[PDB]
């Protein structure tokens, strides 16, 4: 049962291959969006509290929050529920979804670290990938650079420097709104 | 679903009519609102043309007009006392268009002292003195007292309404349609209609 491990404060999600029942028993019979101390995955995962954020069934069916069962059910899914995007407006389609309780019968199990452990997981907590593009709204950059009122707002926007080999150098700035 | 078509009915001669099409949307129906009495709960349904209808599922207040006195106050509905259509609507306390209900007389009373300067519904007085003492005397001038005692000659209320004010509850007939407008507006029963409904309620019980 693979584990898709992701740390939001740095990004750098990674997939973990484990096959030990004893290691995975700490997750069993836990609902989604619950924080469980992931200290059963050896010494390296000690001191880690992780949140169960979802997964997929043995047949690739994603799990839906609030189903409150183990196994698969069929639900009439409307716009904006989960596990479904409407092909046309107002369309609702019946689909199969996995329950929120996790057991051995899964392919993956999406996990999100809530609080940091005592050491650094290799390839996970390091090499912090930045957020690509900064705020576009004027208020959202006022909050980010702590502006009071109208102090060089135009030039305090984030400029995106992009380079390619055949490209002649140039910077890119967004059209700031509101 | 619930259809309001005329083709499922028999012909005037009694012959069986055969439908030439399956059920159409514009000839639909919807479940009854069944407006009870309780905390305000109104549901919005979409209707033909994209307009809006209000399903008053539960109501507690309604705008009832005195009529004779041209007094229109937002008061509280207590219970349903009589319904011409069905007795079960009285038993289940369901608000429909023509059922008559008991409503509080407090705002109408307050308007009556504030306009006519007469006790109404009181038994002996001297019970709300820091307000009624002020509103009886008012130490007002000659012209204001001239207006007030000019308004005394027409300050007669029917003994039936006087009894209802003594009891503290007026009985009034709804005029709006809950489940269509989502409110319970109405008018205070008085005169011959009040006597007719009083005789109906008396003949029903006791």
């Amino acid at each position: 049962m693979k584990l898709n491990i992701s740390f939001p404060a740095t990004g750098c999600q990674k997939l973990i291959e484990v096959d030990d029942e004893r290691k995975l028993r700490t997750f069993y019979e836990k609902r989604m969006a619950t924080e469980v101390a992931a200290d059963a995955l050896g010494e390296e995962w000690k001191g880690y509290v992780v949140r169960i954020s979802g997964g997929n069934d043995k047949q690739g069916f994603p799990m839906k929050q609030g189903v409150l069962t183990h196994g698969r059910v069929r639900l009439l899914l409307s716009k904006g529920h989960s596990c479904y995007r409407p092909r046309r407006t107002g369309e609702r389609k019946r689909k199969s979804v996995r329950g929120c309780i996790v057991d051995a019968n899964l392919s993956v199990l999406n996990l999100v670290i809530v609080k940091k452990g005592e050491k650094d997981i290799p390839g996970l907590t390091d090499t912090t990938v930045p957020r690509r593009l900064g705020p576009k709204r004027a208020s959202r950059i006022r909050k980010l650079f702590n502006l009071s009122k109208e102090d060089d707002v135009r030039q305090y926007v984030v400029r995106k420097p992009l380079n390619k080999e055949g490209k002649k150098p140039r910077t890119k700035a967004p059209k700031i709104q509101r | 679903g619930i259809s309001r078509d005329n083709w499922h009915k028999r012909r005037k001669t009694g012959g069986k009519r055969k439908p030439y099409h399956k059920k159409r949307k514009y000839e639909l129906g919807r479940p009854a609102a069944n407006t009870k009495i309780g905390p305000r709960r109104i549901h919005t349904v979409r209707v033909r043309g994209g307009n809006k209808k209000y399903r008053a599922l539960r109501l507690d207040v309604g705008n009832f007009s005195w009529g004779s006195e041209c007094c229109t106050r937002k008061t509280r509905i207590i219970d349903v006392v009589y319904n011409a259509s069905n007795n079960e609507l009285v038993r289940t306390k369901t608000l429909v268009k023509n059922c008559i209900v008991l409503i509080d007389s407090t705002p109408y009373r307050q308007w009556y002292e504030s306009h006519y300067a007469l006790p109404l519904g009181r038994k002996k007085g001297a019970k709300l003195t820091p307000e009624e003492e002020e509103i009886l005397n008012k130490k007002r001038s000659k012209k204001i007292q001239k207006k007030y005692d000019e308004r005394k000659k027409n300050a007669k209320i029917s003994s039936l309404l006087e009894e209802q004010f003594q009891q503290g509850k007026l009985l009034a007939c709804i005029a709006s349609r809950p489940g269509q407008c989502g409110r319970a507006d109405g008018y205070v029963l008085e005169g011959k209609e009040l006597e007719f409904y009083l005789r109906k309620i008396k003949a029903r019980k006791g």
């Binding site: 939001p8 404060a9 740095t10 912090t128 930045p130 957020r131 690509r132 593009l133 900064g134 980010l144 650079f145 702590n146 502006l147 009071s148 109208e150 102090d151 060089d152 305090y156 984030v158 400029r159 995106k160 420097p161 | -």
Partner: protein, 116 residues
């Protein structure tokens, strides 16, 4: 030691215990004893029988605020860069606004000269 099954009452059914019932529609049920089997066959609802597990969990028998935000670097502006930008409070920003205002002032004087 085999696969453990659950009954009409939700109890564990050990190997060699109870019966198993396969319906025509393709559903297979297993019962712990003839009491549960007779209750199921008489179409009695387990949520209304006091000793079944479903009733116990229906009647609850026997059994805060968090909001944290982090600051991250942006492509083209590191954490050091954004800290340098956002920590210009001690009247440096006043210098920026006043110099921008006076620069726009000579710009507006040029506009007035070339306008009328």
């Amino acid at each position: 030691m085999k696969v453990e099954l659950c009954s009409f009452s939700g109890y564990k059914i050990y190997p060699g215990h109870g019966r198993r019932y396969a319906r025509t529609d393709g559903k297979v049920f297993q019962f712990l004893n003839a009491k549960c089997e007779s209750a199921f066959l008489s179409k009695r609802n387990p949520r209304q029988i006091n000793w079944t597990v479903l009733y116990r969990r229906k009647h609850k028998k026997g059994q805060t605020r968090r909001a944290v935000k982090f600051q991250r670097a942006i492509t083209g502006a590191s954490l050091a860069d954004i800290m340098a930008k956002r920590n210009q409070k001690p009247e440096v920003r006043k210098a920026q606004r006043e110099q921008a205002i006076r620069a726009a002032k000579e710009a507006k004087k040029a506009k007035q000269a070339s306008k009328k």
